[PDB]
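Bug report

Summary: structure tokens for Isoform 4 of Interleukin-1 receptor accessory protein differ between web form and batch submission.
Environment: batch mode, default settings.
Steps: 1) Submit the sequence below via batch. 2) Compare with the web form result.

Sequence submitted:
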Amino acid sequence: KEYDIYVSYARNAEEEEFVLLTLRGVLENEFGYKLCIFDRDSLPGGNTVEAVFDFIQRSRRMIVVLSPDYVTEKSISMLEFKLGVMCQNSIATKLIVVEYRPLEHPHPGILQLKESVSFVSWKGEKSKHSGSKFWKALRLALPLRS
């Protein structure tokens, strides 16, 4: 309804810079999409679970930026993930997995992802340039028009 993409990522500098510099610039300016990024768009205080759930429910898509740090137990990234799985199952929210860094051991959450969920593989610096295979695959997974 209100956002096109909720971007969920691991709260570390490298992956935050991935979202804030590389992902946002392309998603916002080359595709035209309106994003929700919790640390950018949230209000302080209040119930954290309620704020994330509300934001996810108000978004046409949700990107999971998957990396070893994303899946650490008690992380807010896992909170976003689990609430995303919830919204997938309750209101058919479409999730998208951007594979930023491969996981170092299989994670049980991945199997909660419905069949139709797109997996897009980030291959480092070579994926960054416009028209890369990464960007083409992700654009197909996103709404038809902005």
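Above is the batch result. After comparison, the two runs are identical; trailing whitespace caused the diff. Residues 1-146 form one domain. The chain has one domain: 1-146.
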